[model samples]
Target: SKGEELFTGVVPILVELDGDVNGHKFSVRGEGEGDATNGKLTLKFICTTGKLPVPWPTLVTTLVLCFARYPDHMKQHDFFKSAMPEGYVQERTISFKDDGYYKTRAEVKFEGDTLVNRIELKGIDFKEDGNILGHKLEYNFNSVNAYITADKQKNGIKSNFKIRHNVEDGSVQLADHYQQNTPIGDGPVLLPDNHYLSTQNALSKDPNEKRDHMVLLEFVTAAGITLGMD
Candidate 1:
């Protein structure tokens, strides 16, 4: 009751993370009501539903590292530049959908350039049993290339793909043809993320095989944000 009596209506406090940590998702939800100038606010967190394998102190440190630079990274996106409000609280959800791939939904409260208060991603199926060993996301700013790779020891196979889009020329290219189970090649393809999803689906065809499908949402320009795999 220290801060609960200060506000009159619900004050939604949002918490968002770039991705899951150790097979768990983190989120925050809270409400505050009273007076904006003088009120107490209470916050709550919703953590993933399993017992953590690591020590609590290590988990806290790991979570901090995950979100320490979120604001700075988000400022690089063009949409964030024009869409963000100076200083206001608005309840809205942004959704990105790729046909036959996957979809992402983000609920955020924006204050100036800092946004993306919360996000939820669904439709991606990953095999996490110990067969899939590594997943990495890399970017080459010089060539404007983005890479996502997944390695599996069960089948002794590796899947790596690169994506490049030219905003000036309106061209998109995807390296490797594993998405469609076709031979590896590059062409003037479109919708790099969608292709990445397809490739992931292909690579993960064997249900028992350990595999991972990482989702990355990146803004093309330096002034935009980069959301990579966990």
Candidate 2:
């Protein structure tokens, strides 16, 4: 008999791996090398039962500092702190730093589920860049061209209803994260070692996917595993 074997394109190292142990329930996510013997894997674990503290990962936190948007806010709706000038626009920029914040209008609370799972890792070489990674976060902001207010009263309270964007003058900025692979002659670890964790924790099943930073990997320590439930 003759046949061929294929490893296929890109299969994540980890995804939606949920389980419970030691009288606790938990779930795991993210992708990275997993070799129990080599101790190469990444994980973000949530204690489904609110029974214990979140198992935050130092390596993953560093990885986040290197590449992902951190907690942030607008320094000011208008830097000038006044009505926009007749012929002017508001410009803003986001840069890379060790630890920071992001500008999102979400009700980010610190609850059981709302808690961000701190990624954990071991035997992975991805922790070398210090906290310096990712491109400068970029975007544009603008204010209403015109609006009407209730004015003010003795028990003063006022707001504008017409949030007229009038964005004919507003321009949006996006990250420069796109690519087509060209053989640059084995520049650095061209390929991630999927077999084990690679010296640097496998780059990835597909190198292109690495362009976007992801959670670091590490093996977990469990007293006992309940595996899965229906």
Candidate 3:
């Protein structure tokens, strides 16, 4: 891939990780900040001894792509109120700030001597409504999900994590033909790269690895939520 469009697409975002794969440890961090509202995202990918064995980039790119689309994503969701459809009845519906910050931190720690990677897709938010910010204003943001697998290694491992930013979420999958034999929710039945990349972006999560890596993130939405502006 020329990567021109991909670079331009994810230009507002940055994903970084430190530590050595040979050492089996990693400290991944993702950050996004811009002048727009709700234009911030902070993520920390904490994994130990099981970084390489998993599709590490998939995890990073999935969130990167998810947050990257914040501007358009929430604008659509602004009028997308499914909580009672009051926003659509007004002169104009408000949009998500998309300027809030952080997490959905993927911390992959070990489980006993089993040494398997258990990813903690946890999040922490501070509403400056008076907490971490200089003001008395509090805030938050949501949406996006993906499944990362570590089972491809010689010493294999498999686990699934779903992260959401709102009270409700939805998901769908285009898994393998193994519907003929695979269990309903067994293993990672994921959507391939082509299906999502074009819709997301062509940026390879791992620059050194093949850009054709499959997209394990199906979907997450924080749209049209309201309690009837009554």
> Root-mean-square deviation of each candidate, in angstroms?
19.2, 26.0, 22.0
Best by lDDT: 3
Which 10 residues in a row give candidate 3 its minimum summed lDDT? 174-183
TM-score of each: 0.25, 0.19, 0.22
Give a tens-digit lDDT track for model 1, residues 145-178.
Answer: 2221222222111223343312223433222212
Error of 3 at 42 (Å): 17
Per-residue lDDT for 111-141 in model 2, tens only? Answer: 2312122322112111122221222221111
Task: Provide the global lDDT of candidate 1 against the true structure.
Answer: 0.24
Task: Estimate the overall C-alpha local distance difference test score of candidate 3.
Answer: 0.25
* Total clashes for model 1: 14
* Span of 10 residues, lowest total lDDT, candidate 1: 195-204
Best by TM-score: 1
Error of 3 at 163 (Å): 6.1
110-192 in candidate 3: lDDT tens per residue? Answer: 12311112222221232333111222221122233322222233212222333222211232211111001111222322221
